[PDB]
């Protein structure tokens, strides 16, 4: 009933996903997942007032999209002007029984959507090519994880700076934070942002050190809002 399906259901020979900020391969369907299947994940915008998102569909097991196979691209436009992290974009990867992939992106504000259809692996890749991709991925796992963690740390630092700035500029925190503390926060945030813009190829420990620097300024101030 449920174990006899293990032999009857076909599987996805390669992980399928899309490019997220930093050139990261974000998989929505993992290699060896049974098909037909549907996986959904919600994403947001990278920059302030971003008018749309570029959905870049990749296949492969490596951490960075440049080291995987590009399947296609489409844009979802019409996003209302909003700060980074505000719009919610629902992305769905759907594989039918014939291995055909439909990738859909939907704006949660309007339900506005766009999509792309991609043929199965059998008509694009040889078993040799697929196995090769898997092999190469296994061979370079540690390196790939280093890269992934690097980008993760960068995104975390940038998001933290933007969120701190947003927090202290929010009208809700007017009078909760002193103007002086607000100035401390904003100054440190601007310094961190300049650093980020000037150091695109920085490593994990550098990003982390910088985030800790920002935290040294911000944490006692935010913590003070919640004191007994």
């Amino acid at each position: 009933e449920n174990v006899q399906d293990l032999l009857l259901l076909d599987v996805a020979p390669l992980s399928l996903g899309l490019e997220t900020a930093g050139g990261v391969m974000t998989a929505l369907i993992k290699r060896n997942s049974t098909i037909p299947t549907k996986q959904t994940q919600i994403f947001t915008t990278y920059s302030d007032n971003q008018p749309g998102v570029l959905i870049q569909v990749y296949e492969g097991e490596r951490a960075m999209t440049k080291d995987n196979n590009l399947l296609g691209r489409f844009e979802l436009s019409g996003i209302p002007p909003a700060p980074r992290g505000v719009p919610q974009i629902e992305v769905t990867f759907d594989i039918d029984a014939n291995g055909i992939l439909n990738v859909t992106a939907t704006d949660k504000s309007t339900g506005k959507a766009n999509k792309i259809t991609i043929t199965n692996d059998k008509g694009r890749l040889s078993k040799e090519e697929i196995e090769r991709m898997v092999q190469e991925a296994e061979k370079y796992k540690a390196e790939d994880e280093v890269q992934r963690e690097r980008v993760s740390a960068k995104n975390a630092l940038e998001s933290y700076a933007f969120n701190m700035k947003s927090a202290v500029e929010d009208e809700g925190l007017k009078g909760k934070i002193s103007e002086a503390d607000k100035k401390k926060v904003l100054d440190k945030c601007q310094e961190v942002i300049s650093w980020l813009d000037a150091n695109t190829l920085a490593e994990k420990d550098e990003f982390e050190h910088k985030r800790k620097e920002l935290e040294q300024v911000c944490n006692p101030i935010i913590s003070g809002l919640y004191q007994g």
Binding site: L18, E19, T20, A21, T26, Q41, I42, F43, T44, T45, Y46, S47, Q50, P51, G52, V53, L54, I55, E75, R84, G85, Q88, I89, N155
Partner: peptide, 7 residues
């Protein structure tokens, strides 16, 4: 967490 998409 929310992951980010460029335009």
């Amino acid at each position: 967490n929310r992951l980010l998409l460029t335009g």
